Homo-oligomer: A and B are copies of this chain.
Amino acid sequence: ATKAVCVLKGDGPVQGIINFEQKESNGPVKVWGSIKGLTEGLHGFHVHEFGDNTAGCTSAGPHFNPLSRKHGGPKDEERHVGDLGNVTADKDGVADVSTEDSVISLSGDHCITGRTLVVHEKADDLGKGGNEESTKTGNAGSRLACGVIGIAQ
């Protein structure tokens, strides 16, 4: 199996640890972990193109989109490769993450390793918001925490 990991940090209180595992190169990636310090509700959760944190999370660029598609949710055919939807936090400030995704990979051209995982301010509308921004960013707003996805033991 192939494994990867991301430590999410930012300028505020949001922080987390996300793990990735892919049993087979043509198989799904399991994604799990925790993010704390969040406001209650949905927070957009994406892989962005660049593993560049030079100036903070802004440096990561747009959603990872090697197929030049519109933004969507993880269960949509029309999505960016990096579109992992939302994480949802309770009034404890914690989002428990446990998902499986069939479009991201830890090898090949859809590889997310070396790119940035970002948790956002606001909900991602999964491209169903009915405006132009919805099909580019999902209207998820600013970047609260991020990290470069790295190769794990």
A residues with a Cβ closer than 8 A to B are 4-5, 7, 17, 49-54, 61, 113-116, 147-153
Q: Indicate if the CB atoms of B53 and A150 lie closer than 8 Å.
A: yes
Contacts of A54 in B (CB 8 A): 5, 7, 17
CB proximity of A127 to chain B, nearest CB, Å = 24
Q: A7 to B56, alpha carbons, bound, how many Å?
A: 10
Interface of A is mostly: loop
Hey, which chain B residues are within 8 Å of A116, CB to CB? 150
Q: Known contacts being A113-B113, A113-B114, A114-B114, is A149 close to B5, with CB within 8 Å?
A: no
Interface CB pairs A-B, < 8 A, 12: A4-B51, A4-B114, A50-B151, A50-B153, A51-B148, A51-B150, A51-B151, A61-B153, A114-B114, A115-B151, A148-B148, A148-B149
